[PDB]
Design an enzyme around this catalytic site. Structure first.
Site, PDB file in Angstrom:
ATOM      1  N   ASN B 187       0.815  -1.229   0.000  1.00 21.79           N
ATOM      2  CA  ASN B 187       0.000   0.000   0.000  1.00 21.79           C
ATOM      3  C   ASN B 187       0.858   1.293   0.000  1.00 21.79           C
ATOM      4  O   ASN B 187       0.316   2.393   0.135  1.00 21.79           O
ATOM      5  CB  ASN B 187      -0.984  -0.022   1.186  1.00 21.79           C
ATOM      6  N   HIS B 189       3.047   2.229   2.232  1.00 20.59           N
ATOM      7  CA  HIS B 189       3.245   2.732   3.575  1.00 20.59           C
ATOM      8  C   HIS B 189       4.494   2.038   4.127  1.00 20.59           C
ATOM      9  O   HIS B 189       4.767   0.883   3.749  1.00 20.59           O
ATOM     10  CB  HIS B 189       2.021   2.408   4.436  1.00 20.59           C
ATOM     11  N   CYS B 224       5.858   7.127   9.677  1.00 18.79           N
ATOM     12  CA  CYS B 224       6.923   7.811   8.957  1.00 18.79           C
ATOM     13  C   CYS B 224       6.464   7.820   7.504  1.00 18.79           C
ATOM     14  O   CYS B 224       6.114   6.757   6.968  1.00 18.79           O
ATOM     15  CB  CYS B 224       8.265   7.095   9.104  1.00 18.79           C
TER      16      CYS B 224
END
Ligand SMILES: Nc1noc2ccccc12
Ligand SMILES: Nc1noc2ccccc12
Ligand SMILES: Nc1noc2ccccc12
Ligand SMILES: Nc1noc2ccccc12
Lengths: 265, 266
Positions: B187, B189, B224
């Site tokens: 995704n 991330h 992050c």
């Protein structure tokens, strides 16, 4: 995994994991490179190498080191798919050895990828290259097919093309790349696959979003130490083709050079 | 891998790979954390989750996010060893859910590790946390055991202890850590395991060379982003060494994670 009937090659099946895939939900080229090194290690173990140096290499403090890696992928396996990989080694005289790999879809049996690598002998302490002696060669010749068996048979194909040095200014760059503990192998050296990831860091995200990586050729010249810092440089040379350079952030000492070829999705 | 007989937990066997081990030729804690996420994903897939959000979660743009990860390892599996991992989920009311794991040596059947995680529901777009609705809960309750089944049953056990915030100056630090494409999930991330690696970056190499990591507890507060830069801070708090950890953005010092580690002398 297992050695084949003739004992001259090794096959292993891998189920692609959830963390091994990118945004297309297919395996990244770094996952593929990790699987090639895993099947290579399992091959060495299966033919008797202690947990791939022979008796004479251990006596002389000699090791195998990668000089070039070349990978061509036609289809990346999806998350949950089973990919079967076959690997074998062949000596190329005193120069060193070549390890080749063939990747297949386990369901259809079709070839989805291929790879080849050139390995040279180096003294592990002094880092001096040197050719392969007859004594060392005789210890590993019994594990290699004698007739040529090439993943890349075509006369003077992409796997053997000379790579030029990228000239400043680079079109794109990613600076200050440093390895963390997960980037190191069991011998505390930076894993060869980390360098592939660093090369790819300077490719713009727009290329990664609209293209698929088809071919990557990487020359290894010097290793990145655990406390070194690397800059990744890329310039378009064209399908899209790029020229790549990894060098130390400070003095600009070359560690790797490579090329990539990308196909529009 | 496969769901167990009662369909309320899932087991999978893994052969430890050559690139998955450290200098001791045993699996790193990051390899273990990757295997825990792999068996968790295979469990979700096996019980019907589409390629783990329910029908109502997808309609409301809600996702599961990790709030805490706690791992305790007694023995790290060696290169070539087969480790068997069993996992299950349990709801903890409206707060969220807990996923637990047990790791065993496939040859001896002995428990070599255990882990537990707390998951909260978040709106994917606004990042606003929320309690679990009865409609969402009812969709996943049928896949969880109803009687309590805890990897960490003990009374005041380490998995539930509050973690303080490290005060400057830190004893040790690793600055300017950035994720690369291999650190991202499907995704785009940052993978949760990357944060464990970043926490461990500020542990001195002398500790890593003379000790084995026994326990790690990590709180997740903020993610992050792909273009953020992180500083990893560590201070000793103690045969055993204990450390307090903090990950924060390199610029403004915004906290992303806090944690603790416990190390035993080799
Ligand atoms: N990286 C590797 N590819 O093949 C191998 C065979 C033995 C040891 C290492 C490797
Ligand atoms: N690891 C190996 N399997 O076969 C080989 C032949 C030559 C050199 C190394 C190996
Ligand atoms: N990171 C994970 N651990 O367990 C899971 C189950 C479903 C999806 C993700 C995970
Ligand atoms: N992925 C899952 N397997 O079982 C579950 C129970 C509750 C929530 C998620 C899951």
């Amino acid at each position: 995994g297992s050695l084949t009937e003739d004992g001259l090659s090794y096959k292993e099946k891998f189920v692609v994991r959830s963390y091994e895939v990118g945004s297309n939900k297919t395996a990244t080229v770094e996952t593929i490179a990790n699987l090639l090194q895993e099947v290579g290690c399992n091959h060495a173990q299966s033919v008797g190498f202690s947990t791939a140096t022979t008796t004479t290499m251990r006596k002389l403090h000699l090791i195998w080191v990668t000089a070039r890696m070349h990978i061509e992928i036609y289809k990346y396996p999806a998350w949950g798919d089973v990919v079967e990989i076959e690997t074998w080694c062949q000596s190329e005289g005193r120069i060193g050895t070549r390890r080749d790999w063939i990747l297949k879809d386990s369901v259809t049996g079709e070839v989805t990828g291929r790879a080849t690598s050139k390995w040279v002998m180096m003294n592990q302490d002094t880092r001096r290259l040197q050719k392969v002696s007859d004594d060392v060669r005789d210890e590993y010749l019994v594990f290699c097919p004698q007739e040529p068996r090439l993943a890349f048979p075509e006369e003077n194909n992409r796997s053997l093309k000379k790579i030029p040095k990228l000239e400043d200014p680079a079109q794109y760059s990613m600076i200050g790349l440093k390895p963390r503990r997960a980037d190191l192998d069991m011998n505390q050296h930076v894993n060869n696959v980390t360098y592939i990831g660093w090369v790819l860091e300077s490719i713009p995200q727009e290329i990664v979003d609209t293209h698929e990586l088809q071919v990557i050729t990487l020359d290894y010249r010097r290793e990145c130490q655990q406390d070194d810092v690397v800059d990744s440089l890329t310039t378009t040379t064209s399908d899209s083709q790029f020229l790549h350079l990894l060098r130390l952030s400070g003095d600009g000492q070359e560690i790797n050079r490579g090329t990539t070829l990308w196909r529009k999705k």
